[model samples]
Target chain A: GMKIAVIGATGQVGREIAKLLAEKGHEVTAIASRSKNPEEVAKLGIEAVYVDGEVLDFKSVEEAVKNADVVISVAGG
Target chain B: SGMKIAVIGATGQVGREIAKLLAEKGHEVTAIASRSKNPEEVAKLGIEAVYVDGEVLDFKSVEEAVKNADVVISVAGG
Candidate 1:
């Protein structure tokens, strides 16, 4: 299966996307707003999420999207 | 007058909202997004949007974005 990323995985949209993608066996990575506890995300089967409260910056996005066949941003506004 | 506020990660959920809301409220908002390699993306918001690509958000870029601003909001979204 293709890998997929869900940006903002701690929220309403993001969490769902991450969950659905993981179940689909797409090597999901969940990107949340900072302090995401990498361990916690992994428990849910997501590769990564969050480094700050706002940006999640450029590098985080870079990494999440880097090895994926697809990426989806559930991040808001 | 309202403050010259800079919002980093201005394209993201919280950042995008706050930036637009502040601008709509008449504050001078400078929208910034690291992924916005094209400054034009921020311009679409009818305000200034700059590209910094955060992972490499060097001192100069951060300074330039913050320079002369009354406030700088880093939407770390982590």
Candidate 2:
């Protein structure tokens, strides 16, 4: 029932959270440097964002989410 | 990752400072208080302020903000 934004869709943990949140019927936006090989992030209903710029990354993500309820970040420490 | 934080008695002098400190540290701070609490001021400090009547009697109000929080601090000591 919430729109979540995950910042590390390329990693194992990020993918799992993205998968689970998507499976639970939440609007999931996943971001990372790249996509899993043949993992098909779109199949699980998660949109992937690949980026390296800190300021640019958040700015892009912010533009995408207007009513985002949750932000699950694993991109950095 | 910064802890998803929730604080009680966030309107009080000590509680407010603690909440502010946490917020400045980049932690997500959710403040719980009674109807007459500092909701506006706390939110201005980047803390999510939740109006909760009594901690023991009315838990749902507190739960509204605490479900996603990882750390909870109660400064409402008697």
Candidate 3:
């Protein structure tokens, strides 16, 4: 089964979730608010989607939430 | 030789364990968290506290925190 996409995938918990999912043989699409280099994404062994939007932005949030069976938002305190 | 240890998320469960254990071993400890908490708590146990916005995997924050530390034990996981 395809695992959920994790936004802020570079965050502490976000990275853990992505790692766990990938370890479980599930596909993970990592989303980051700031632009990340292709090398960084490749190093993580995941697909990357960099959206130039804040967490509070609707358009960005909506786009990120779409095309994913599940979305895990691991942002903020 | 004396060693300095920086414990991120020092107020949390695992972080607290690390602090306690390290202190017992007579290692100098620096407890860090997102917001400023009472350094007195760590001070009572002979440790220092430095507060910074919790930035996981952030190179600059990590570098700043690791200044003068011989080793770091990061227990920062939500």
Candidate 4:
């Protein structure tokens, strides 16, 4: 029941990890990337909470990752 | 405190500034970008810079750049 925040959740690997983690009964607090895609998160078949957490922006990253037990970032340039 | 740090978008203004400031703090700084914008400045400041041709979106490049870093901060701007 850990709270996890996943960065780059729109990508293939990010999405896969996010989905698997959530399926295992952990709380996926947030998923973020430079772009927002509700459709992609919905397709993961998990509770959807997405944000445009641009990797370069401290404010965005801080807001997206707030109170998460773990942060997994697969985002790149 | 000094720690190994990797910065993405090191060719841009924000990225460059962050890299410089971190290096000034005595951190093991690595600048990651498609190309280095200011080589001499970074060199003089004691930053370890990497020009990862494919830029921050390159998975392998990012992995390589940050593998040894204790903290990875991306200031990349498009």
In terms of DockQ, which candidate is strongest? Answer: 1
Local error of candidate 2 at residue A19 (angstroms): 0.3
Q: After superposition, how far is residue A13 of candidate 3 from its true place, in Å?
A: 23
**Which digits, one per residue and each the tens of the lDDT, describe model 1 over residues A1-77?**
44333322144333543454456454544333232222222122222334456654545444333322212222222
**Candidate 4 lDDT by residue in tens digits, B1-78:** 444444433444434655565566565655444322221121111112323234444544344434433223222111
Cα TM-score of candidate 3: 0.24
Candidate 2: docking tier: incorrect
CA lDDT, candidate 1, residue A18:
45
Q: Write the per-residue lDDT of candidate 2 for residues B1-78, one digit (tens) a residue.
A: 654444333334433544565567675655433211221121111112323225443544334333333222211100
- Give the Å shift of residue A29 in candidate 3: 25
Of all native A–B interface contacts, model 4 reproduces a fraction of: 0.00
Order of candidate numbers by DockQ, starting with the best? 1, 4, 2, 3
Which ranges in model 1 have alpha carbons more than 4 Å from their true place? A1-77, B35-78
- Top lDDT hit: 1
Model 2 residue A71 lDDT score: 21
Chain A TM-score compared with the true chain A, each model in order: 0.37, 0.39, 0.38, 0.38
How far does residue A14 in candidate 2 sit from its true spot (Å)?
0.7
The sequence of per-residue lDDT tens digits that candidate 4 reaches over residues A7-73 is 3323333344445546766554332334223222212222122324524544433333332221222
Overall lDDT per candidate, in order of appearance: 0.35, 0.34, 0.34, 0.35
Stretches of model 4 off by over 4 angstroms after superposition: A1-77, B34-78
- State the displacement of the C-alpha of residue B61, model 2, in Å, after optimal TM-score superposition: 35
